Symmetry: D2
């Protein structure tokens, strides 16, 4: 059974001055994340700006990350969209370039039923030997993958995990209870890392780990040890930092926070925009508040 | 400038048994629409399953419809997605196959800010000489194009209309008030046609016009002639039929309805699914209730 | 069948400098309403601060408004609360002081089921021979009285109307269709007056009629005569004025607006507060924008 | 500093066959709760059907529970309503019958602003020497007590705690952090007990402790010890039992569940209704699945 560990990081896609994928900065960010508590890398997720990458950018980004990671941590490619056939296609291409797993988002915009989503995820899972991580995100796709739906899908052999960004640790709980023990439930919301884990989540698919990966690993280890007060103080920092990373449409704030800590990964592609001066000042304060 | 009339139809995209575009059936549907109360055709919109069409299928569909329509009513291509650069490229290709305008949805899934959407729509609008219709649809894209953003964009000369599927005639009211008279505000919810026109909407971008376009046309004319009891009875029919067309994810029910009235336009692409038998029966009862 | 006409006003309750009911200002306000387009007066509704009136004060206010009105318009007492047996006692007491109807709100806070509300409204309506108006207001009670529950209740002989503050003219449409012709449907949202009447609503239970009741009447008459452009201009005034009356918890803004136009009805009881200076300045500007 | 312990229970109010307060059953319920993990009793809260009790009934219920409890655990009287003046009055009466604290709900139905709530809670807190627990319940009152409002109120000497039934452990986190260490933050949702305590909540104000208080106590002792396997297992039980308790308007399900475990506390007052035979069967099956 593939193990993504306790912190999968949904990596940003570094862009150069022309907005193209900056491959050399990508290498640098990949090694930095692996050195700072990242235990698996989700490439070309929401946070990697999957909406504005082309299919061929995605494939090349996947290829390059696989090569740089060199099997040090699992590489999960965000291949699902709201088009089942295009999702199968991009999943085949990801597999061909050696990724370890695919992450498949709930179809956004076209609002499929539970049965539609069942068939969509079933057909994408069936097209690859790779492990599949479902990605529940009603705050962007509107629909939710219902508990019953996730459970039906978990019975498929290569559907092994869910990244639940639904904000609800009680639906998480119910998924944990109703699926086999080898079905890994991850939080998809940084601030819920600690409470999700309290109820049995395996960990977090993270954005905040770009800047506080080590603190998050410390938090998690403290909690598992029963060191509640130490875990709570770090949870407080996690929640505060997470809030500042979503003051504006993600991933611009985290791309900006990274620039502020010495790791320039470029800007973002339209329709996302650079932070304003005032947004930047607000963010820099929060960044400057992190214990060094 | 351009006049879309009172009923723009968001045409379905007819598919054959294998999901391929059925261009001969598209011909029959276009002519059917134009002779049943449609005054402008929106090709490749949400209802046309734009999410599951490739960019190449979109242009081919735009070209076919332009050619069949033969200038009898305006052809509006659904070229916008949540990717600004891609939207520019598709918009250019639609302009070169001779569409009369483009429609641009609020970017879904990536949750841009008001300023981000301002820049997205301006960039697309400045890439074409064609008239542009904005498409506000928070029930699919989550974000709303705020009134102030709409008004800002309406000051751009080739941004000429909005399809407001926000379900709120008070925001449509405020848009009407705050924009110049040459900016046309359309309802994007069939059931709200009558109350939207009551507050000064130009008309409806319709789904139900695929099966009750003539009743809709009579409704609008009754209203405008001060025949309120007649307008109200047609409105009740319009509301009832629209409800039944949204009992499963659109446009499966309208494609099924079309088949029930002799115009078989095939089925839908994953992640959408055909109606179940139980669903088919409930829909057939509603169709049989339409006064013939 | 009792008739409330086109504009029932949810009258504010004038308070003196100590927060007590001001009987002289109540008289003055009633006479003012009747001369300024109000066809029926809802006394002790939400806008009358029913939550902070004692039971004895409500009945005293009913009694006073009845004597002042002297059968010139129907008097509807807001007797319903979230406690069915208290609502029965208060309804009987209102019946004894000679009101013409009672209005019964969907129970707030305790979240009853559809069947609980059915029984709640049934038992109160049986406690009196007077006409009963239901009041649907999900943005205060959370629950909504479903269409089917409204229909079931409309078959009760003395349940004759509904004030529908659900903000949705399509559910109003559906209530209109499914209930008998002698069941009157009112918008409970001023800005929706015109679009609700477009779909067959009887009129508005209004707040804005305290300051623009004459314009409201002209709008309704313009509309009914098919003078659409005139209706629309006044509709725009209605919406703009209504919005300013809801920028702070109601009814403080409408009480302040009344003071501004020379009819001082005092302030509000805790937990409501007077407008801040900045709020006042902003409301004063909208009030100065009403054409005189 | 008053200490409500980890499980405050919002006690149901036992009624006799006539709907009147059953004082003998209240005694039995109180002694049962105290012997089954309850560390503080909230009397006449939501679950105690505060909306259907008269002011006289509440005071008699408060006085009786005070006598029975006999200082064994703190007695918290649910004296706040949406009327500040009435709340001051009832708070004074509860203080006189010897309760240890009062719980003040966010005003429902009238939708006060943050400053309005601030003045409301401040004026009630000033009127009593007793400790005050705030109660945030936006799922019943619609408005939320903002984090900044709670922080301001926590600075008042006798405002010492909040029952946060907001469903969001991230706002709880922020309240914990921004308030002093002697301000206790309780969850008001049973299913969130563990995740809320993981982030720093002192405990739960519970409904399910009526029928699984011993299991919740065990779950909490396991969690505080750091035995997450036993805690997660009792957490699953708690989530499932809680869900079965809110399948119809509360407290009818927990009153029925009580009867099922042999402590009949009668039925509920309109607008609430007994469970159907069907609901009773479904509930009974969940009650049967609790390891005995
Ligand atoms: Na499991
Ligand atoms: Na305009
Ligand atoms: Na009717
Ligand atoms: Na604190």
């Amino acid at each position: 059974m593939i193990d993504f560990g306790t912190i999968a990081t949904a990596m940003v896609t570094p862009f150069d001055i022309n907005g193209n994928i900056d491959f050399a900065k990508t290498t640098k960010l990949v090694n930095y994340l692996i050195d700072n508590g990242t235990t698996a890398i989700v490439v070309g997720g929401t946070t990697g700006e999957s909406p504005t990458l082309t299919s061929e950018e995605k494939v090349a980004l996947y290829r390059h990350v696989v090569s740089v990671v060199d099997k040090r941590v699992p590489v999960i490619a965000g291949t699902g969209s709201n088009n089942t056939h295009a999702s199968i296609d991009l999943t085949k291409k990801a597999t061909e370039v050696g990724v370890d797993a695919v992450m498949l988002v709930a179809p956004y915009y076209n609002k499929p039923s539970q049965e539609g989503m069942y068939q969509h995820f079933k057909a994408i899972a069936e097209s690859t030997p790779l492990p599949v991580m479902l990605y529940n995100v009603p705050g962007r796709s509107i629909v939710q993958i219902s508990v019953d739906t996730v459970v039906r899908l978990s019975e498929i052999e290569n559907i092994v995990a869910i990244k639940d960004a639904g904000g609800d640790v009680l639906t998480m709980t119910e998924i944990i209870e109703k699926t086999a023990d080898d079905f890994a439930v991850y939080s998809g919301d940084d601030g819920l890392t600690l409470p999700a884990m309290a109820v049995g989540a395996k960990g977090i698919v993270s954005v905040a780990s770009h800047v506080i990966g080590n603190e998050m690993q410390e938090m998690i280890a403290a909690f598992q040890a029963g060191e509640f007060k130490k875990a709570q103080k770090l949870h407080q920092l996690l929640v505060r930092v997470t809030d500042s990373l979503f003051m504006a449409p993600s991933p611009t704030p985290v791309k900006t926070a990274l620039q502020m800590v010495g790791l320039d990964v470029g800007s973002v592609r339209l329709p996302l925009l650079p932070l304003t001066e005032e947004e930047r000042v607000t963010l820099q304060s929060v960044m400057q508040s992190i214990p060094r």
